Design a protein around this ligand. Structure first.
Ligand code: UEG
Lengths: 148, 153
């Protein structure tokens, strides 16, 4: 088991944790996760995951310029994108109840609601409170206790 | 246009095509492939592949800063990394017989032997003679027959 694999599984676990604080307006029977753009640590997600409640999380890769990310995805896990691609993605998510989490995120000021920092002894993440507030999903504030 | 999983599967086949033109000085029983950095089209590779002669390609992701990439990997599928990360990677491969292929076309300028262009109707690729020469492996020039046909409607 490589360190990328260990981390990938941790990313899976961190994500499940975050998911538990999120509520969608209409809760789907199967939670759709979309991995968008190049990622290092999404392989665990892509094998599939199940929430504590029993809801299955189905994950697949979708393209940065898929115009239907907002209706096809309940959760976005965002990899390497440039500014024009990131804007494209979030224009698709606009007005839809979509949880967004980015794999990197030096700053986490614009774009995703939560930004993982995966390198390092443990995975940490930051919260973008403004993204959270414009996101369409409800987020229990206790999740911030799990952030950095 | 094409789907992501379609492209990934096609990436597998282009890579197998490229492998077929390459020879390692001491041919291993199992070809070791390392996916390094963030990738969008490597999920197929990571299932493992088999070459026409029946040799298996074992694939796994490895860290950019793994100093033993050159020793642990026969092939590098290079993802989308930064300047410093890339330099680390190729410094690690120096003096080791390693085939390097990049997911994006930008990397032929900076160390990768082959560089894929995945968007479009077919997957095309370009190559760099400098990086090939210093690679420690032999590449038959016929490899560009595959690139040319891929680039042809
Ligand atoms: C594409 C290409 N790759 C490799 C070589 C020699 O390794 C040649 C011939 O020098 C070539 O044309």
């Amino acid at each position: 088991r490589t360190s990328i694999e260990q981390r990938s599984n941790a990313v899976s676990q961190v994500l499940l944790g975050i998911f538990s604080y999120v509520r969608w307006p209409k809760e789907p029977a199967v939670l759709q996760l979309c991995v968008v753009g190049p990622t290092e640590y999404a392989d665990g997600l892509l094998r599939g995951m199940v929430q504590a409640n029993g809801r299955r999380v189905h994950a697949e890769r979708r393209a940065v310029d898929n115009p239907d990310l907002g209706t096809l995805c309940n959760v976005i896990y965002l990899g390497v994108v440039d500014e024009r691609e990131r804007q494209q993605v979030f224009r698709s998510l606009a007005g839809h109840p979509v949880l967004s989490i980015s794999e990197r995120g030096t700053e986490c000021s614009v774009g995703s609601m939560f930004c993982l920092n995966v390198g390092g002894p443990r995975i940490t993440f930051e919260a973008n409170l403004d993204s959270i507030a414009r996101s369409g999903v409800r987020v229990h504030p206790s999740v911030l206790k799990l952030a950095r």
